[PDB]
Design a protein around this ligand. Structure first.
Ligand SMILES: CCCCCCCCCCCCCC(=O)SCCNC(=O)CCNC(=O)[C@H](O)C(C)(C)COP(=O)(O)OP(=O)(O)OC[C@H]1O[C@@H](n2cnc3c(N)ncnc32)[C@H](O)[C@@H]1OP(=O)(O)O
Ligand SMILES: CNCc1cccc(CN2CCOCC2)c1
Length: 411
């Protein structure tokens, strides 16, 4: 039973989702004028706050809330520690709407108690390929194609309630207020991801991890040692040897991305992403924002051949607080971001990603099995993790799809 989610325009069960054959909205059609102009009511001791996510001090406030209260693993060994610079990057893409960043503060002392963020994204979210085939068979192709045009929607992230305020039904109030503010800007769908199972995902993928600093990963109990290593006189020396990487990239003409690369990177990325059922559409400004290198935040390299960009990869940094081990403060993780290969096999491109991340002091490389991430798991010694990432839409019926049909990376 879901006292809140049962009231929302989402499919309610897996059985319902199994029956969906066309992409389209769930809710009654509404207009901006129908939506309350006033913020959703909240208790008198609380106030709504719209942070300025280009004021250093407001970013710092959000940073502290998330550092102390955001997502942990299931054993509460690690907690995400997104940096202030990362938050500015993630929250302020081109044409972001400041009003979509929603906070709750205690009115008396302005202590930040809760947060949710929305940013604009242009998303292809029309009926998936396998369902369009069925629609053709049945003479229903017009209906199946109705919502094929890329849609300007909201991407929700960073929902967080302070630990001291948990289980008090604040999350539904945050979600309702974010929904109101987005609806007041004539936007009616959202996309979001979560580790937890909610009604009702359109896709779900396992996490994968590639050890870069295995001695540290084992120390902090991120990683275990296969029982088979006990056949060796020295399990750990063998483990280090297993995960060893070259000191320098192998692809000649790999270099960091620069601003003049933007249009070529846009073209090769967009050509690649268009093959997936669900995926973002990026302008030059959005390619520049999401992919140009930013120290400590995002790292992007291109393969240039004959003065042409033919391949690229990107990764972003999210460290996590190591909660229970006093020997290390942080786990330094690199996450596979967008990429495109046209000249070399993907495993050869992504090896250089691992090389660069290792050289820069990263402990592990993480990803979900979206895109063609499965195509280099075995060659590059990624192992499946405990975690999954579930993909959701708000106010959008969508047939179930494999995670290898999803091309949207979520930070
Ligand atoms: C058109 C525009 C639309 C815009 C909005 C689109 C929708 C966006 C939706 C948000 C996408 C976020 C994407 C991310 O950021 S995923 C990351 C979520 N954040 C964390 O996990 C951080 C650590 N945890 C917390 O801060 C709290 O435990 C949270 C805030 C998660 C819940 O707070 P609390 O534990 O104090 O509980 P409550 O009593 O206040 O509320 C209980 C209700 O909340 C439902 N719940 C629990 N977890 C989630 C979850 N991750 N997404 C959606 N709903 C969730 C739960 O089923 C229950 O509803 P119901 O079962 O009774 O029905
Ligand atoms: C994509 N945005 C970050 C994210 C948010 C919520 C949940 C997750 C995935 N969890 C992490 C903890 O270990 C279990 C899996 C990731």
């Amino acid at each position: 039973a879901h006292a809140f989610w049962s009231t929302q325009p989402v499919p309610q069960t897996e059985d319902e989702t199994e029956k969906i054959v066309f992409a389209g909205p769930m809710d009654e059609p509404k207009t901006v004028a129908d939506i309350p102009e006033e913020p959703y009511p909240i208790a008198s001791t609380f106030e709504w706050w719209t942070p300025n996510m280009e004021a250093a001090d407001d970013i710092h406030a959000i940073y502290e809330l998330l550092r102390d209260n955001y997502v942990e693993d299931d054993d509460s060994m690690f907690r995400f520690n997104y940096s202030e610079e990362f938050l500015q990057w993630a929250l302020c893409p081109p044409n972001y709407i400041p009003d979509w960043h929603v906070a709750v503060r205690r009115k008396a002392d302005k202590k930040l108690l809760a947060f949710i963020a929305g940013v604009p994204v242009t998303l292809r979210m029309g009926t998936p390929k396998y369902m369009k085939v069925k629609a053709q068979e049945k003479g229903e192709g017009e209906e199946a194609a109705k919502y094929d045009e890329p849609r300007h929607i909201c991407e929700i992230n960073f929902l967080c309630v302070h630990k001291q305020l948990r289980e008090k039904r604040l999350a539904p109030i945050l979600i309702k207020e974010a929904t109101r503010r987005v609806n007041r800007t004539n936007v009616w769908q959202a996309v979001y991801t979560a580790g937890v199972l909610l009604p009702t995902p359109y896709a779900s993928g396992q996490y994968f991890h590639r050890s870069l600093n295995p001695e540290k990963l084992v120390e902090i109990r991120f990683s275990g040692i296969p029982a088979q290593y006990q056949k060796f006189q020295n399990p750990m020396a063998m483990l280090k040897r297993n995960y060893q990487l070259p000191s320098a990239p192998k692809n000649s003409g790999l270099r960091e991305m620069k601003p003049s690369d933007v249009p070529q990177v846009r073209r090769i990325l967009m050509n690649y992403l268009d093959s997936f059922d669900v995926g973002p559409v990026f302008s030059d400004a959005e390619i520049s924002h999401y992919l140009l290198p930013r120290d400590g935040v995002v790292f992007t390299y291109v393969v240039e051949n004959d003065k042409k960009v033919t391949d690229f990869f990107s990764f972003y940094r999210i460290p996590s607080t190591v909660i229970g081990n006093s020997n290390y403060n942080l786990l330094n993780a690199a996450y596979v971001h967008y990429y495109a290969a046209t000249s070399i096999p993907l495993h050869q491109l992504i090896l250089d990603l691992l090389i660069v991340a290792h050289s820069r002091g990263f402990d592990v490389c993480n990803m979900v099995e979206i895109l063609d991430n499965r195509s280099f798991v075995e060659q590059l010694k990624f192992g499946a993790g405990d975690g999954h990432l579930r993909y959701y839409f708000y106010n959008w019926a969508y047939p179930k799809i494999k995670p290898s049909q999803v091309a949207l990376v979520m930070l």
